[PDB]
Amino acid sequence: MELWLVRHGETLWNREGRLLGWTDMPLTAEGEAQARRLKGALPSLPAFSSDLLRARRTAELAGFSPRLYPELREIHFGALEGALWETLDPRYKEALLRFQGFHPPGGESLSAFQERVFRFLEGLKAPAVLFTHGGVVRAVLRALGEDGLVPPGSAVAVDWPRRVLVRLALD
């Protein structure tokens, strides 16, 4: 199934390097710029989006009117929301780097996050554009055997659940 996953435009915590999950941070001016550049670069297909502001706003500026789904939200970092990556305990850094065995207090475990994301994708019966988050794109890319790191405001097209089709980044 052809699915286009879009990582929302940048927020302040991107350059600040803070874990951004359910904290509802808005897009920065540049984030909105990145969003607008996406208009015309993404296929005209049904759209779905995380209900978090940064995702919804990216979808809007990109020219879409998505149906909202909390299932497309970034992982919930719990007590680690807002924590600087730099000062993150090595045990957490390792879990996030290896993408396994991560369960922050008051947050969501990586395994539960993957289950949530993959169940949502499984329900898509036709090609669509998904406005979501870095961790969601990473979960999908990693499950397809590839590095899941993509720039804010960029997109990836995949043939789910088989392979990555293309990675799109604009300047």
What approach was used to elucidate this structure?
A: X-ray
HSE (side-chain half, CA atoms, 13 Å) at 65 = 0
Mention the CATH class of domain 1-171: alpha beta
Is residue 133 annotated as part of the catalytic site, yes or no?
Answer: no
Catalytic residue, from 74, 76, 108, 133: name it: 74
- b/e sequence 122-144, b meaning 16+ C-beta within 10 Å: eeeeeebbbbbbbbbbbbbbebb
Structure tokens at 34: 């990145």
Report which of 140, 97, 112 is spatially closest to residue 5, judged by C-alpha positions: 140
DSSP code of residue 9: P
Cα(80)–Cα(83) distance, integer angstroms? 5
Tell me: is residue 153 an annotated ligand-binding position: no
Tell me: is residue 17 an annotated ligand-binding position: no
Cα(121)–Cα(109) distance, integer angstroms? 19
Name residues whose C-beta falls within 8 Å of residue 73's C-beta, 6 or more positions apart in sequence: 21, 22, 50, 51, 52, 55, 132, 133, 136
**Amino acid at residue number 148:** G
Catalytic residue, from 8, 32, 76, 108: name it: 8
Tell me: is residue 12 an annotated ligand-binding position: yes
Tell me: is residue 2 an annotated ligand-binding position: no
- The domain segmentation of the chain, as residue ranges, is 1-171
Judging by DSSP bridges, how do beta strands 47-49 and 163-168 pair with one another?
unpaired
> Is omega for the bond preceding 26 within 30 degrees of 0, making it cis?
no
